[PDB]
């Protein structure tokens, strides 16, 4: 049974899964609340002071 997917997409998938430690698992998912560390002070405009 030959390659079911072209090599370019396999490479793209591998590099997407590599840039994340552990690949894609159920426990290492990003948080649905997408708040950067600087979220509050930046949205409030008080980062400088």
């Amino acid at each position: 049974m030959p390659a079911v997917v072209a090599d370019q997409y396999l490479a793209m998938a591998k590099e997407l899964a590599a840039s994340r430690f552990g690949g894609f698992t159920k426990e290492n998912i990003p948080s649905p609340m997408a708040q950067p560390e600087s979220y509050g002070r930046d949205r409030l405009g008080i980062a400088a002071v």
């Binding site: 590599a18 840039s19 430690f21 552990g22 426990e27 290492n28 560390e37 600087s38 400088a48």
Partner: protein, 162 residues
């Protein structure tokens, strides 16, 4: 974060003045050292799995008393969290290399480090051992200025732990 460009701009602003020669030369140094730093980040990102699993194993070897039942390291969840934490440290080290300043490390790891560890009873010596292993492996993965950059940021993290 407290990267070279940002601290330059912030100190210039706090004195209400433009960017003078001092600041521009600092920025030039940053843009030149980008090359070794981005190279170190590439090397560590390509090798993140081997680095992190080796670090976890090194921790479990220098701290044998952790794996047994009854304490922190026993259980698949706790070891998964170990690997996740070291992946965090290595991620933020590569971020520091890319940004050419300890800003990512400071903001994301060092601020609140001791209080969080005390609250969850996580011994800093564990992460010191993991980072020492990562330092050793980067001694082999990297050469020249890339090695110096990576080791500099790893040592910054270790000093923050101890």
């Amino acid at each position: 974060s407290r990267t070279v460009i940002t601290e330059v701009i912030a100190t210039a602003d706090s004195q209400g003045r433009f960017l003078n020669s001092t600041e521009l030369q600092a920025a030039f140094g940053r843009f030149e050292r980008a090359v070794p730093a981005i190279e170190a980040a590439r090397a560590l990102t390509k090798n993140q799995d081997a680095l992190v699993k080796g670090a976890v194993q090194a921790v479990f070897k220098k701290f044998p008393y952790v794996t047994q039942p009854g304490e922190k390291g026993y259980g698949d969840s706790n070891q998964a969290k170990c690997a996740r934490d070291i992946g965090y440290y290595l991620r933020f080290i590569t971020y520091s290399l890319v940004a050419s300043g300890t800003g990512p490390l400071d903001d994301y790891v060092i601020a609140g480090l001791r209080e969080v560890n005390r609250a969850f009873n996580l011994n800093p010596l564990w992460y010191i051992e993991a980072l020492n292993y990562i330092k050793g492996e980067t001694g082999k993965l990297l050469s020249g200025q890339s090695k110096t950059e990576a080791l500099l940021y790893i040592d910054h993290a270790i000093n923050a732990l101890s």
